[PDB]
Amino acid sequence: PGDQICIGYHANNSTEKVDTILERNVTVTHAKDILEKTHNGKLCKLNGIPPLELGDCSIAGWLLGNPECDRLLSVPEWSYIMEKENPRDGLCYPGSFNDYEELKHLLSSVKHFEKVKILPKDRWTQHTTTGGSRACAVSGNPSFFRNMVWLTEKGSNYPVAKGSYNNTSGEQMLIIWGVHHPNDETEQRTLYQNVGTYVSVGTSTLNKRSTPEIATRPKVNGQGGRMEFSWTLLDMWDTINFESTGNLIAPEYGFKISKRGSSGIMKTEGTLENCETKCQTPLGAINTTLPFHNVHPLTIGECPKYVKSEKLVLATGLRNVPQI
């Protein structure tokens, strides 16, 4: 029996397993897990920029100025917006908000507003502007959405109410207005004096109008009346004209779009923690170099790609075969 040389391959203590088309549960010498499965369970700043935490406020509650949302009257630039599934503080005086989901979608490309006092309340010299409701009470007295103006009768008269604003602000501006639909004729008379009224809004492109509807409805927050809100994005250098014989809920402000970019509304019951991330999910932040994750499909930031997989492991080494 002479000198010998033998050809062979590496084995080790690895218990790493992979699947193939032909065979499942194969032990290999080396493998690469390419799926991130972990997150930190926290809502964080995104690249150092905090989200806008609405708390118990809805998007409508914020922009109208529900008095329960006063912390939000001036807010800095945000990276995403946190909204609860069913926020308590929205339309405190009950009603509706036309094209509300379109407005929320707009917010996915906006990172900051500058609130501009476009129609200062003191200029309504022919109408009462202090009107409020117990539905919006503050410290036990009637009040109202902070950003809006409830025009009512003055000296027992309501002349045609006309206001206009030319957007010279340098960017497109979000403007909201409403029409009050009273419960009954007493309400209409005591508030407006006039009957058969309308609210007209007109820009270069929009012409929307309303005749207020008097009708008995179930009480919501104490009120059978409703306020129906609408909105528009007023282009640079365009003018908006409001004209009404009664029932106008006028904006005092507009929200100039002051920063644009990728953002979004995250649905969460949680609160911001003192943490930093490049990738935020509703369940928590991800910090990984891996190319895939299975944490949640709705992520904001510089994220890995989401898959439903429970495992994604690539073989790199060879079949790990028991020694002889």
Ligand X SMILES: *[C@@H]1O[C@H](CO)[C@@H](O[C@@H]2O[C@H](CO)[C@@H](O)[C@H](O)[C@H]2NC(C)=O)[C@H](O)[C@H]1NC(C)=O
Ligand Y SMILES: *[C@@H]1O[C@H](CO)[C@@H](O)[C@H](O)[C@H]1NC(C)=O
Binding site for a second copy (CB under 8 A): 94-96, 162, 181, 200, 202-205, 207, 209, 213, 215-218, 220, 226, 228, 238-239, 241, 243
Which of residues 20 and 25 has its CB atom nearest to ligand Y in the complex? 25
**203 and 238 Cβ atoms separated by less than 8 Å:** yes
Q: Which is nearer to a second copy, 73 or 318 (CB)?
A: 318
20 sits near ligand Y (criterion: CB under 6 A): no
- Closest contact distance (angstroms) between CB of 16 and ligand Y is 11
Burial class (CB in 10 A: 0-12, 13-18, 19+), 220: middle
**Which CB, 15 or 141, lies closer to ligand Y?**
15
Binding-site partner at residue 264 among another protein, ligand Y, a second copy, none, CB < 5 to 8 Å by type? another protein
Any contact of residue 27 with ligand Y (CB under 6 A)? yes
Among 4, 25, 141, 216, binds ligand Y (CB under 6 A): 25
Question: Which is nearer to ligand X, 9 or 237 (by Cβ)?
Answer: 237
Q: Which of 70, 129, 89 lies closest to 249, judged by CA?
A: 129
**Nearest approach, Cβ of residue 218 and ligand X (Å):** 5
Least Å from the CB of residue 1 to ligand X: 24
Residue 82 — φ and ψ, nearest 5°? -100, 120
Locus of tokens 């009708």:
215
Sign of CA dihedral 187, 65, 204, 96: negative
Torsion of CA 55, 57, 58, 62, to 10 degrees: -120
Cβ proximity to another protein, 49 vs 290, nearer residue = 290
Binding partner of residue 216 among another protein, ligand X, a second copy, none, CB under 5 to 8 Å per kind?
a second copy
Distance between CA atoms of residues 227 and 97, nearest Å: 8
Using CB under 6 A, which residues numbered 160 to 179 contact ligand X? 166, 168
Residue nearest to ligand Y (CB): 25
Query: Hey, which residues does 82 pair with through a beta bridge?
Result: 53, 266
Q: Please identify, using beta-carbon distances, which residue of 26 and 283 lies nearer to another protein.
A: 26
Which residues in 89-118 contact ligand Y (CB under 6 A)?
Answer: none
Residue 70: how many other CB atoms lie within 10 Å: 11
Closest approach of ligand X to the CB of residue 167, in Å = 7
Residue 110: both structure tokens together: 């906006």
Binding partner of 86, given ligand X, another protein, a second copy, none, CB within 5-8 angstroms per partner class: none
Of 128, 184, 132, the closest CA to residue 157 belongs to 128
Binding site for another protein (CB under 8 A): 1-12, 18-24, 26, 28-29, 32, 34, 99-102, 104-106, 108, 233, 264-267, 291-292, 297-299, 305-309, 312-324
Using Cβ positions, the residue closest to ligand X within the complex turns out to be 166
- Nearest C-alpha neighbor of 115 from the set 62, 187, 185, 40: 62
What is the distance between the alpha carbons of residues 314 and 31, in angstroms, rounded to a whole number?
6
Site mask for ligand X (CB under 6 A), range 196-225, x = bound: ----------------------x-------
Whole-angstrom Cα distance, residue 81 to residue 263? 8
Judge whether 131 and 121 are in contact, CB under 8 Å: no
**320 near 27, Cβ under 8 Å?**
yes
The 8-class DSSP code of residue 123 comes to G
Residue closer to ligand X by CB (options 75, 220) is 220
User: Running DSSP on this structure, what letter comes out for residue 241?
Assistant: E
Task: Give the residues lining the site for ligand X (CB under 6 A).
Answer: 166, 168, 218, 237, 239
